[PDB]
Design a binder for this molecule. Structure first.
Ligand SMILES: O=C(Cn1c(-c2ccccn2)nc2ccccc21)Nc1ccc2ccccc2c1
Ligand SMILES: O=C(Cn1c(-c2ccccn2)nc2ccccc21)Nc1ccc2ccccc2c1
Ligand SMILES: O=C(Cn1c(-c2ccccn2)nc2ccccc21)Nc1ccc2ccccc2c1
Ligand SMILES: O=C(Cn1c(-c2ccccn2)nc2ccccc21)Nc1ccc2ccccc2c1
Ligand SMILES: O=c1[nH]cnc2c1ncn2[C@@H]1O[C@H](COP(=O)(O)O)[C@@H](O)[C@H]1O
Ligand SMILES: O=c1[nH]cnc2c1ncn2[C@@H]1O[C@H](COP(=O)(O)O)[C@@H](O)[C@H]1O
Ligand SMILES: O=c1[nH]cnc2c1ncn2[C@@H]1O[C@H](COP(=O)(O)O)[C@@H](O)[C@H]1O
Ligand SMILES: O=c1[nH]cnc2c1ncn2[C@@H]1O[C@H](COP(=O)(O)O)[C@@H](O)[C@H]1O
Lengths: 339, 341, 337, 341
């Protein structure tokens, strides 16, 4: 009708002439204008992904973790404190549009938090916009990420409110049912391209949040203009993630649920389930890092800015999708970076 | 060849700036120019969906039930009389193009019915047009819904026949095999927005009938210009629905069949199937989930009213790959969700 | 260009003054051959012989006897049909050395229509075939297949063919598009050939890929004078072969004429299909479906169907909406699955 | 975003007028200007696909096999020698970009190799262009194939580097995960078609490598303009391939793995997977079916030669439903088909 939007599986990157080996690329990126990460990875702010244990591991990996707000204000400030009490580690906290929102900001700021994430289901709303201005009035130097959005117009209005960064993604999450119960959402790839274009026109970087399943998907997001990528599912199985280990018919599992699921709220827009135990975060990141560098090797990109400036996309069909994945083969040895 | 028509699964709505919250929006819709609903929901006129018990619950919930015509004229009048006697409640009655069509209409009008619906497989037929013209000639004050159509040309013809509202949908039904056995039909979303646009010019509202699986599908149908959504499958497993609770493999199910199926025809070539649907419980609990999802969508599009929703709605087309990520993926769902399965 | 098959498209409802019990299914197969209903059984060694061809003509269609037998045997099969009242009968010939001997035999048996069935109808061998036959028998009705292009219609109509069979690859037992990579999606194929055929006053037969009665309507609306089917009639008692039981279920062997078994590099497969029972009740569901379809388009005649037919394309999501969904079917419909 | 790119399964070939029978067509092709093959088939340079046993079988069958480089320099030169001394047989040898690459080239040339393949994940790079130049400057008469690429620009750079032949394919391999872990690649048919077109302007042939499952897939590649087709999956299950015949549940299998898999590389990040495929018996039977399938295709398009096949070939695009129609459907296949599974 208006246009057809695409997600990550609809698209492929086209190989460019390369004069750079995968081990020669640099994954440095600017999260906000005052905060630089060594790798463009962020762990999701959920009660089953990121607490003290995960945030410390991520920051030590060159990324950053966002402490979830599904706890008391006192507890969250203590979680942030733990991360800051172990070296100069970057740490983020989650803030929501509520009645005690400023009291919550006051606590984590005193806990010396680096970045604040103001995430609601609908970022392009009166609550979020006025909320950002209200936070930027008391703490002008505090770095603020707002979300989530899916349109260029939302990027502009959030920038006007004083946001330093915006989170992009309405519906792509593996645990998300927003597009099903509300019928609302924009396919993540198109959403990232449209928002990053407007973002680079105003000087405000964007974050690709949700829908990422493979390392190659991250390369598509980074080549679409995203300054960083947020994942829950990929990190939820890691040992650094909250929750106990469950054994189900010989295999090991970890629980994983959306912040809009029934259990987390204790009308839902998320589900609740389990994912396979992956082990330590370091091993997951290694395969992710290696895959991205390999991708940037194919495109001749030494940095992430060169990746974006010289990336060409092509659309693939259902048949092309089957060709991209391994096919007509009975896999006997599982790979660390696939399935 | 002519064009590409889309269904609900094909599209998604784009979020607008929002200065409203889901608990602040109004769901009041306008069925006909005289009949107003509090929520744009109505139960399908099917022998396994809407009887007096269901029609009562639908009305008290803010919507309206439509009594099916698979029974004697005397019995259908009694079903309506049961609904209207228990409080001042809205009620609908189904009429078909038959020989005793007018006498069936005569009976339900005597039972103080609010709206008549001339539902048939092919609404854009001579029998319906001449049929509506007779009902409107005898009862000029009686509100008439006529279906089913799928093209704007049929909207012009039925409205010209005197209809007050039209019902859209040929094929979308969960129990429907019309598109398979006849090869005839139009994907419901394209069908709805085509007819609603034409009906908007003539001032005749349209009804999105069939094909709605989740609460988000309704939001799409309302944004496409429909004034109300008709559903059979969603309500079929509810307590207020006709039929006994049958147990299959230790789970509770109710029988749900098509009006054009083999079983329904025997009651009084098939274009429907017969099957079972899980028992969902009381209607209020199912309506609550539907309303909540609809109010969320209107919160996302920043629309306080159903009209404003239609005025500022932007659809985007997703592929089968986009359909995958739109649903939950890469996770073993263990806990149960009230609005997803 | 992207070409479509039957499941890609849907017919759009028109204004209707006619009812399904009033329509007419009379069609003109050739110029001087007409059927009461536009259905014909495939000339396959597991579908059509005298018993099937007799049943087909009695219902109002016509069956074509397969050529996978001796010239004497196929001549007897035709006679067995012709003896059983004034019943229509068809016979298939191929581009062979004794093709003229086979033609002479079935003509002597007073067959009504002949069909040259080749994998590639648009070839030198088939054009010579039609032209050589029409020289000896200017009054013998000839169908020629298979083709998929309008150019092929022209070249075949100019050879003296009375009708052309359309379909390369849609067959349920076919692997041509897989082993050769050649073919055209049947709907676009019939639609393109039908338009060219109307210009020349030559009818086209939609052959292969027909699963439901709605699919048959789509072909007729595209401009096909008739529809040929193997799979829908394969499991019937009137079809050749014996009933084989496999793990409790009664099946009949159905196989492509280009499979290893029928040849005794294949372009067909050999499989089993469920026992459907008598042909009469299958036809009753097909005819009634086609009637329903025509009623939706306000078409009293087949030629009126084609003139006012408007197609529309659906996605794979619209496909899942067209079939019955989100319900556990407990009773098998007589015309669906 | 650019145009949409297609896979073999996305398209079909339109039949042409034909005066030729499949038994009359010729399958001769020029792999390079100096090298001619009786049949346009190649085996992949992989440790689970091609060694002297396979190369000899491929050669005797009219094609050529490329010895892989997962062995020492003395071992590979030894394998090449076995093929050359067995009879007047063609043989290829695979080379990678390393410090000992010129030493390895010297060895296989001394073994009288016919063609060198510079195999790498990304042929369009500084390393490969320098390699082709460094080799050609020392061995001007030696035939050099370069890959892998997927763009016409890469063709020009390789041709300008001195390459005699270009291998295309980024990610279509059956055991490949490059498009999944790097998100990089081009659907093979579009790649082959683009690279062949640029090749025709320059006068340099292109190989279609990977993603071929059926004989009909090969025909599309050849019609797109490729000079030959390189296959791993189709050949790896044969007896002449390396690796023992493994058994599982009364069914005999063989091990087939990608050269970028964890097992073949022997921390690292893999771009391939290891698995198992069915035992197909002898290569002679497999080749016979592939040849027969191509001869059939050429007869459909009225093409007596491969060059005549490319010139009058018309492609059409099919949807998902067309894909279902193209394959066998609604039938329980009982007997085994020698060219379909
Ligand atoms: O709050 C939720 C659902 N929800 C979630 C959640 C979080 C992330 C993604 C999806 N849903 N978490 C919740 C926790 C409690 C209650 C409702 C919740 N959804 C909406 C929907 C429309 C809105 C319009 C304007 C302003 C806010 C709106 C909020
Ligand atoms: O004859 C068959 C295969 N075949 C079939 C068959 C029939 C219909 C559809 C597909 N295949 N039946 C056969 C019976 C015996 C031997 C081969 C057969 N295939 C071909 C393929 C290309 C041709 C090009 C020019 C002239 C004739 C050509 C024939
Ligand atoms: O009557 C039914 C089938 N049918 C149904 C039904 C109702 C809704 C959706 C699908 N089918 N209910 C029936 C009850 C009795 C007999 C037939 C019935 N279908 C048709 C089909 C084409 C028509 C064309 C012109 C006029 C009327 C036509 C009717
Ligand atoms: O070589 C591999 C991975 N790899 C493979 C392999 C072979 C064929 C297809 C895919 N991958 N085989 C390997 C063997 C050892 C180590 C890495 C290997 N990956 C890449 C990816 C992008 C590059 C860009 C410029 C230069 C070199 C690049 C290398
Ligand atoms: O329950 C919810 N409903 C919808 N989206 C959610 C919910 N919980 C988390 N998300 C989003 O999904 C992202 C992670 O999804 P995933 O990594 O693709 O599994 C988070 O960073 C949030 O943006
Ligand atoms: O048997 C039938 N054949 C075709 N459509 C039907 C039949 N019975 C009911 N319908 C339609 O399908 C609607 C309900 O389908 P659902 O709510 O989408 O499951 C009804 O309101 C009718 O419009
Ligand atoms: O072996 C074969 N290979 C390819 N096509 C075949 C073969 N046998 C029959 N056909 C075609 O397929 C049609 C029937 O297919 P179906 O109706 O789709 O089952 C026949 O009328 C022939 O046109
Ligand atoms: O591990 C790998 N990763 C990616 N591609 C590979 C790998 N190993 C082999 N290939 C390619 O895949 C081709 C064979 O794929 P197939 O014929 O589709 O099985 C080879 O000729 C190589 O071009």
């Amino acid at each position: 009708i208006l246009k057809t939007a695409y997600t990550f599986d609809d698209v492929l990157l086209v190989p460019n002439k390369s004069e750079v080996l995968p081990n020669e690329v640099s994954l440095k990126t600017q999260l906000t204008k005052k905060i630089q990460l060594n790798i463009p990875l962020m762990s999701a702010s959920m009660d089953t992904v990121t607490e003290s244990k995960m945030a410390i591991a991520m920051a030590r990996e060159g990324g950053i973790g966002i402490i979830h707000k599904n706890m008391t204000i006192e507890d969250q400030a203590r979680e942030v404190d733990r991360v800051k009490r172990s070296g100069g580690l970057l740490c983020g906290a989650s803030i929501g549009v509520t009645n005690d929102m400023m009291e919550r900001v006051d606590a984590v700021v005193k806990a010396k938090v680096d970045v604040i994430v103001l995430d609601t289901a609908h970022g392009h709303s009166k609550g979020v916009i006025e909320g950002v201005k209200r936070i930027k009035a008391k703490y002008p130097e505090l770095q603020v990420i707002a979300g989530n959005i899916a349109t260029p117009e939302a990027v502009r209005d959030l920038a006007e409110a004083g946001a330093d960064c915006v989170k992009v993604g309405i519906g792509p999450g593996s645990i998300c049912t927003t597009r099903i119960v509300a019928g609302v959402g924009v396919p993540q790839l198109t959403a990232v391209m449209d928002c990053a274009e407007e973002g680079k026109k105003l000087g405000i970087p964007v974050i690709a949040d949700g829908g990422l399943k493979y390392s190659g998907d991250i390369v598509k997001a980074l080549a679409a203009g995203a300054c960083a990528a947020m994942m829950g599912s990929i990190f939820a199985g890691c040992e650094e993630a909250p929750g106990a280990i469950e054994i189900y018919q010989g295999r090991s599992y970890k629980v994983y649920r959306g912040m809009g699921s029934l259990g987390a709220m204790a009308v839902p827009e998320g589900v609740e389930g389990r994912i396979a135990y992956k082990g330590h975060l370091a091993d997951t990141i290694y395969q992710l890092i290696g895959g991205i560098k390999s991708g940037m090797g194919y495109l001749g990109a030494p940095t992430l800015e060169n990746l974006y400036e010289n990336a060409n996309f092509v659309v693939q069909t259902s048949a092309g999708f089957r060709e991209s994945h391994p096919h007509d083969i009975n896999i006997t040895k599982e790979a660390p970076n696939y399935s």
